[PDB]
Amino acid sequence: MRECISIHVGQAGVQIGNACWELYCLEHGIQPDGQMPDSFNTFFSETGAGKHVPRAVFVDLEPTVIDEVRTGTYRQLFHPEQLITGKEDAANNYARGHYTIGKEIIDLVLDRIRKLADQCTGLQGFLVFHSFGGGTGSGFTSLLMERLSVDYGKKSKLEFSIYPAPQVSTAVVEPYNSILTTHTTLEHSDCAFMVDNEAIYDICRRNLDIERPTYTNLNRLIGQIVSSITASLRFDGALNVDLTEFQTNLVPYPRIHFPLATYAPVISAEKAYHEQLSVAEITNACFEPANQMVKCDPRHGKYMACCLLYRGDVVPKDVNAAIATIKTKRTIQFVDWCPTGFKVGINYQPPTVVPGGDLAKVQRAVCMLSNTTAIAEAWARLDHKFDLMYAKRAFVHWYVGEGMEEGEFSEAREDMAALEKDYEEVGVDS
Amino acid sequence: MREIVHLQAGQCGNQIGAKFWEVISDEHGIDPTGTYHGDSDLQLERINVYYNEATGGKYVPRAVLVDLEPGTMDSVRSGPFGQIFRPDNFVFGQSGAGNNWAKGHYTEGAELVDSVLDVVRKEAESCDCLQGFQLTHSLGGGTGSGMGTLLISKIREEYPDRIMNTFSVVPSPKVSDTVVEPYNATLSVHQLVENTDETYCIDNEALYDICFRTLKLTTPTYGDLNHLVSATMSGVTTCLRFPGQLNADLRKLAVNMVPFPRLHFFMPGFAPLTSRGSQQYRALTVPELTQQMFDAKNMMAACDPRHGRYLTVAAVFRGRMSMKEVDEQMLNVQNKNSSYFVEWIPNNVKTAVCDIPPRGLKMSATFIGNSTAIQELFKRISEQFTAMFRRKAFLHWYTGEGMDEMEFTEAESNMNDLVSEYQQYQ
């Protein structure tokens, strides 16, 4: 009755979609065959044979990561047409994914969006999982967001996007595809939950005591954030939130829609039962900068809005006492123009432990999504990296030879020049 | 609401400190798994003193375990009752202290104690009404006497208005298991007399003679010596967690006992001990326990009480017994031993009676003595110090790390100040 449509594009989107859609199958007790042994209707559509199929789209230009899904454990569950494969990848280039290669397969996707969105009785919005550092994840998304806003007018479009780490790197042209696509998604999005890989590498070592993690260890921690965000639409609680709701309570202006996502508690199975997990000690863990899942320090900046989401055996009394202690802390600073910054949304179900994982069976959990001016520090470094490479006109012939002009490079720098000018005009006290 | 924080340092304090946890968990009915497994409701009424309720109905101790080498930390964690501690309470280094006092206090201990008191600051803040501290160490080494003295001075700066109580094993005349032992003993008493409110001295030789004559043991291994000390640890503080006929917590054992701030070193004891052969031939009643309490063979220090004078004596009786025969009989000790007790203090005796005897034994009585005869234990360390210091032996290890020669002159001078006051009041 309240239906959500998830879009996973790129290589990051599919590999998160292997771990994200594992939890949705296990939360409602849905077998990998597609059959249970009305809370599931947000992700699973009924069929007359008692078969539940996901409401998801998987897009990539290389079938060498989707054929792993088609020959994996969940081959009988996903729809044969909900996994869309190109023939050749975008090959770490923005112009290939936006003009030449990503143009040829855009018509098949919106054909499949329209078939899924017509069966939705009440559609709340879209969720996007992609990566800025890829050719497909930043190229295909840039025109997909354009042709979604033209067709579907004023729906919500949230983002779960992986940002490049400040030190750890995969590619070499990642400043180009980071700069170029933010010129597009600034005016074609509503809110952007933002993550990276260095920050989760740190957390998985010092908290879960995994010395040598892989992407599967990172994908499940991202897959636990998306569950507690959506958990109000699924199950009932004391007071609920909505995808329409926290879009209104986290962005004050159309240009600033970049919160920071944090999850607590993260702990192993061995250490959980000796410590006592009070409601205070999981909400004083989210405000610690060492637990933040974006490599930036909020002590440099000032908070502007916050959203608190709770699960499990939580009492509304002690949430009010825990937040009231936070407001007396001098090390947390708010803007003068936001006297009321918090919102609490409460759900009853405790989180589910994935067998074979490393997170423990907990009784309460919390995900905190704060808009903060300290994300301008994250963009100061990468705006500096773009200038240091564009000075010698490196790699530009890869971009002008695919169809786009060289003049798109200077315009996308002026857009994030003025976006940087906006963030100190908001964080200045009146 | 009455909270005690435990801390374990050194190897001698870790093994006695670990052995302390099997004794009280037997009295409170806690399994090695961590569940309450007993017979009486009366055990669970006061479990906040030592343990912390966790999620799922399991109990964890309130203790912090610190030692510079991880060998003994693995030896305690791999014990019978070792699986109940907090895994984040295990703070260990990677380099051995080397039995050097300057290694535990100045260089290799100076980088650890930032992470040591940080755990202690967590356990102290979550308490409702903190009462005191309990730290187990040994004077004869560089690990227990290096960080144990250091953790005393750092905590007492943060929490001044408490009672911080240490149980310390002292060097012995005949045993001598360390070569630089009088050097490392004198460097700690300089700061034990300054920032500790109650110190109990335990001897290794006196615990051997109790096991050899009173208990008539054949081979008194180290598993038995720690079980004698663990009885007195759980006997002095039994009026904080059991209902008794006349209650007395540690601060009431503070005001009664110390007249002057620098005389707080106590000689303890346990009193219902018997041998295996003569169990059926000994009468168990309060006038028989009193003779065993004041017996010189049952004291845990190599000091003869007949060669000194007594300042203040306290007794924590345990079990269902009278109060008139308790009070009349341990007054009869004062009248007959009139010359031995001091004349300028009336009523040298404090008596306390609790109504819960320990596991399997129907009565108990822990002796605690504050006498002037402890000056001879402090005199022998001072004389051993002079014979090595006049040749400057073993002193390139201390002076080679940042410790000065003028530090050693101050420690012996303050040691001779302490032996002067005991003779002054005698």
Partner: peptide, 16 residues
Amino acid sequence: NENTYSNRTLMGNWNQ
């Protein structure tokens, strides 16, 4: 702030 225990352990407002 405060360590909440079971009802039996006489800690806090056990009486009500």
